[PDB]
RNA sequence: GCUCGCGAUGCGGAGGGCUCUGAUAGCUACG
């Protein structure tokens, strides 16, 4: 009893009322107090758990951390408690892409604030708490309707909400290689570096997080969240919709899972193929849940299941980020899941509204995360980029699937990730049609 | 004691209700606090005598897809009528032991070696069914209000909606049909706030009247039982349940023998059952012959108050299953069909009941009444 | 006999908010 053991240790302690949003299938609250000298805060859709979690919060903070379940704590990653506590860490990103997103949706009025997953990216450079800025911002729950699909890049295949916030993490790391290799004035301020080993590297010490307001779908959901106490199959996404199937073993094209498409990035990096041909891979440091966090099967789902992995190209690695859940949790809401994806990058206007059924815009427009409006800021990288600073030979590219094809140690690690995956029994990638890339800019 | 059906009706109605009271001392316990009561009651020969209460239970709410067991550990339904199938199985499960104990007690068990493999029931042993009221779906969700002779009967019989399946659905009212055909379920979608669809109990009488009321596990070892009546305490019409129980997948064809379309016996009772003033009770209790005290189950966990699993839940049911298999003569079996001992693939070896099942899908799909609705498959991967 | 669209009046499981009562338990204050 969280109310309780504060109120019997501390004095008469009263509140006010501050946040009240939506009602019925959908409704918020947050309250907040003042225990020796604080502003702890608590969110919750009824008063009574809003301001519940508030005091253990509070206690945990003040006198000392919580002793929950076991499940509830977080794994620490092969290396990094610098980020101060792992849960404190978690707390900071949550309550900095619920922000942004708060900016983002003029403060939670917009239409579009009702959402049923938010996910972010942020980008850390100092273990000082200033030294922190969320970097993408993303909702949505649905995927293309593969009806609609256009083939030269028009259409947004997935639009779960972390595969989006990934996406705009690429289109923020173009903007960061363009500052690098533009006027040279913005060569000081930048991310990247020229790489210790021929090519480009992320300078010391910048990292990325991810955030999503639940476990991804597929096998780190998949668990009984109310009995904590063998199998890690991959799944496939279910028509323009929210939930999994696994896969056969060893009728409409399918997507891969959102835990599927997590292990790869902790594989062969977040940047992927055309990205490799330029940067080192990168990869998230932590995974942070809003919600539906259980330590064992998380971990199942991001890296362990794959530990059978050997033959590790050049710079590669079974990356083991660091794994949390927030303390103020979120809830579930029964209902069907909006039809649109918003996403948003750091350096942006607006947000960008797509509908998650046709992976084109509100409008009818393609994305300014789709395929090919990706492959023309990759050129544009080509062009003003110095002919030696690449990583392969790839000689002035004309298609989407070669150029993707000319990162042939990305390749490579991609290669040795599907065969942990089958030498695991976990089944077999799916893998999209191959005419779905044959588009150039023309 | 040679009846009209009427008495039989009235007769079950007067017992499952004594039942309840009695397990309720006199309906005082605040467990008594019911909107909706059901029970099976066992003939051996038409005499009152011949008559016992095979189990109670009440209930009108299904479980929060939040708390769904991975291990066969949460009820997944606890209407009244779904809940007393259950309890049956508890007490099949009984008088199966009560046969492989040793031939002074076989004596005494309602089942007999069959003549064609596994176990049959005696000749002149029947179970009828009782809900205080129409069970939802098909049954009911066209006219949920006692019928007044002023008003005779359905003025729309040839309505699309009529006769389709229909599920209930989590944070939902009524029972809705099956959309685009069908929409299977999963386990992360319903995490995620899929809404948990629930098949209709309407439908799942209609099912239980081709497949029988024993399940798949129980089929590896008896021969199929079908419900002889349907007993309605309250909102009867005549048309609708008949339509609802069988009529509506008349056209059901090339069953596995010893399966049928079953047309029991549908009665009300003289003196219909009054509403409950109150707020819905969110428990059910469930109660079978031979059974010490009720059990009294939260439905939306599907869990007891201290967070038990039920006597019911599919875990429990594995287990009996399990003690059974081990005492039962290896050629004595039904289907000889090896399975892994998980409660999924057991279930499979019950190739038959899965024939049957397998027709009746079939049957209402072709009939323009919709695909069935499944269950995630996650919730039968477990073992013991 | 029905189907579909738009209305209209009703019928029939979730969330929230405020009051009433009893009880359990932790705490004070007073005589
Ligand atoms: O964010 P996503 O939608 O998951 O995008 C990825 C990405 O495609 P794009 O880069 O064109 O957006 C992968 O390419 P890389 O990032 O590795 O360069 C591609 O895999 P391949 O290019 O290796 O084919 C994969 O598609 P799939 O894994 O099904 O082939 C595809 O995800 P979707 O096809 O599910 O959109
Ligand atoms: O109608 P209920 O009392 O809820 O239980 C039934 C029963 O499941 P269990 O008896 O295994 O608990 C059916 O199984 P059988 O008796 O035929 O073996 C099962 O059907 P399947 O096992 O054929 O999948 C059906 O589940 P479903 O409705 O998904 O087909 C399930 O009912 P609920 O799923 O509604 O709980
Ligand atoms: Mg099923
Ligand atoms: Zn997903
Ligand atoms: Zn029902």
Same mark, same amino acid.
């Given at each position: 009893?969280?109310?309780?053991? *504060?109120?019997?240790?501390?004095?008469?302690?009263?509140?006010?009322?501050?946040?009240?949003?939506?009602?019925?299938?959908?409704?918020?609250?947050?309250?907040?107090?003042?225990?020796?000298?604080?502003?702890?805060?608590?969110?919750?859709?009824?008063?009574?758990?809003?301001?519940?979690?508030?005091?253990?919060?509070?206690?945990?903070?003040?006198?000392?951390?919580? =002793?929950? &379940?076991?499940?509830?704590?977080? @794994?620490?990653?092969?290396?990094?408690?610098?980020?101060?506590? @792992?849960?404190? *860490?978690?707390?900071? /990103? $949550?309550?900095?892409?619920?922000?942004?997103?708060?900016?983002?949706?003029?403060?939670? +009025?917009?239409?579009?604030?009702?959402?049923?997953?938010?996910?972010?990216?942020?980008? %850390?450079?100092?273990?000082?708490?200033?030294?922190?800025?969320?970097? $993408?911002?993303? %909702?949505?729950?649905? #995927?293309?309707?593969?009806?609609?699909?256009?083939?030269?890049?028009?259409?947004?295949?997935? #639009?779960?909400?972390?595969?989006?916030?990934?996406?705009?993490?690429?289109?923020?790391?173009?903007?960061?290689?363009?500052?690098?290799?533009?006027?040279?004035?913005?060569?000081?301020?930048?991310?990247?570096?020229?790489?210790?080993?021929?090519?480009?590297?992320?300078?010391?010490?910048?990292?990325?997080?991810?955030?999503?307001?639940?476990?991804?779908?597929?096998?780190?959901?998949?668990?009984?969240?109310?009995?904590?106490?063998?199998?890690?199959?991959?799944?496939?996404?279910?028509?323009?919709?929210?939930? %999994?199937?696994?896969?056969?073993?060893?009728?409409? !094209?399918?997507?891969?899972?959102?835990?599927?498409?997590?292990?790869?990035?902790?594989?062969?990096?977040?940047?992927?193929?055309?990205?490799?041909?330029? /940067?080192? @891979?990168?990869?998230?440091? $932590?995974?942070?849940?809003?919600?539906?966090?259980?330590?064992?099967?998380?971990?199942?789902?991001?890296? &362990?299941?794959? +530990?059978?992995?050997?033959? *590790?190209?050049? *710079?590669?690695?079974?990356?083991?980020? !660091? =794994?949390?859940?927030?303390?103020?949790?979120?809830?579930?809401?029964?209902?069907?899941?909006?039809?649109?994806?918003?996403?948003?990058?750091?350096?942006?206007?607006?947000?960008?509204?797509?509908?998650?059924?046709?992976?084109?815009?509100?409008?009818?427009?393609?994305?300014? =995360? #789709?395929?090919?409006?990706?492959?023309?800021?990759?050129?544009?990288?080509?062009?003003?980029?110095?002919?030696?600073?690449?990583?392969?030979?790839?000689?002035?590219?004309? /298609?989407?699937?070669? $150029?993707?094809?000319?990162?042939?140690?990305?390749?490579?690690?991609?290669?040795?990730?599907?065969?942990?995956?089958?030498?695991?029994?976990?089944?077999?990638?799916?893998?999209?049609? %191959?005419?779905?890339?044959?588009?150039?800019?023309?």
């Amino acid at each position: 009893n969280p109310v309780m053991i *504060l109120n019997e240790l501390r004095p008469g302690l009263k509140y006010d009322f501050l946040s009240e949003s939506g009602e019925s299938h959908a409704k918020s609250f947050v309250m907040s107090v003042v225990v020796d000298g604080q502003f702890f805060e608590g969110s919750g859709r009824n008063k009574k758990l809003a301001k519940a979690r508030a005091a253990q919060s509070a206690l945990a903070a003040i006198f000392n951390l919580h =002793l929950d &379940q076991t499940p509830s704590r977080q @794994p620490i990653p092969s290396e990094g408690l610098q980020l101060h506590l @792992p849960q404190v *860490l978690a707390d900071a /990103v $949550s309550r900095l892409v619920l922000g942004k997103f708060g900016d983002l949706t003029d403060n939670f +009025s917009s239409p579009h604030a009702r959402r049923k997953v938010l996910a972010g990216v942020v980008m %850390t450079t100092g273990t000082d708490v200033k030294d922190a800025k969320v970097i $993408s911002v993303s %909702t949505g729950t649905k #995927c293309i309707n593969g009806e609609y699909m256009s083939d030269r890049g028009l259409a947004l295949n997935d #639009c779960h909400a972390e595969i989006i916030s990934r996406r705009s993490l690429l289109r923020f790391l173009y903007t960061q290689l363009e500052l690098y290799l533009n006027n040279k004035d913005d060569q000081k301020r930048s991310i990247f570096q020229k790489s210790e080993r021929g090519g480009f590297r992320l300078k010391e010490n910048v990292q990325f997080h991810l955030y999503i307001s639940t476990s991804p779908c597929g096998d780190a959901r998949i668990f009984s969240p109310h009995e904590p106490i063998a199998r890690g199959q991959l799944r496939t996404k279910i028509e323009s919709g929210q939930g %999994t199937i696994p896969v056969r073993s060893n009728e409409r !094209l399918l997507t891969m899972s959102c835990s599927d498409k997590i292990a790869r990035w902790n594989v062969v990096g977040i940047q992927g193929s055309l990205l490799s041909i330029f /940067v080192e @891979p990168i990869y998230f440091s $932590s995974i942070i849940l809003g919600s539906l966090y259980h330590g064992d099967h998380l971990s199942r789902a991001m890296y &362990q299941r794959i +530990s059978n992995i050997e033959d *590790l190209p050049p *710079l590669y690695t079974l990356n083991k980020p !660091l =794994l949390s859940g927030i303390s103020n949790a979120e809830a579930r809401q029964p209902g069907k899941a909006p039809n649109f994806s918003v996403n948003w990058t750091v350096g942006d206007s607006a947000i960008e509204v797509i509908n998650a059924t046709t992976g084109k815009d509100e409008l009818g427009r393609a994305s300014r =995360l #789709c395929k090919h409006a990706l492959y023309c800021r990759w050129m544009r990288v080509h062009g003003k980029v110095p002919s030696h600073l690449l990583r392969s030979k790839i000689t002035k590219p004309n /298609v989407y699937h070669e $150029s993707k094809l000319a990162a042939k140690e990305y390749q490579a690690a991609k290669a040795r990730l599907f065969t942990a995956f089958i030498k695991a029994g976990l089944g077999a990638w799916v893998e999209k049609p %191959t005419e779905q890339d044959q588009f150039s800019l023309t």
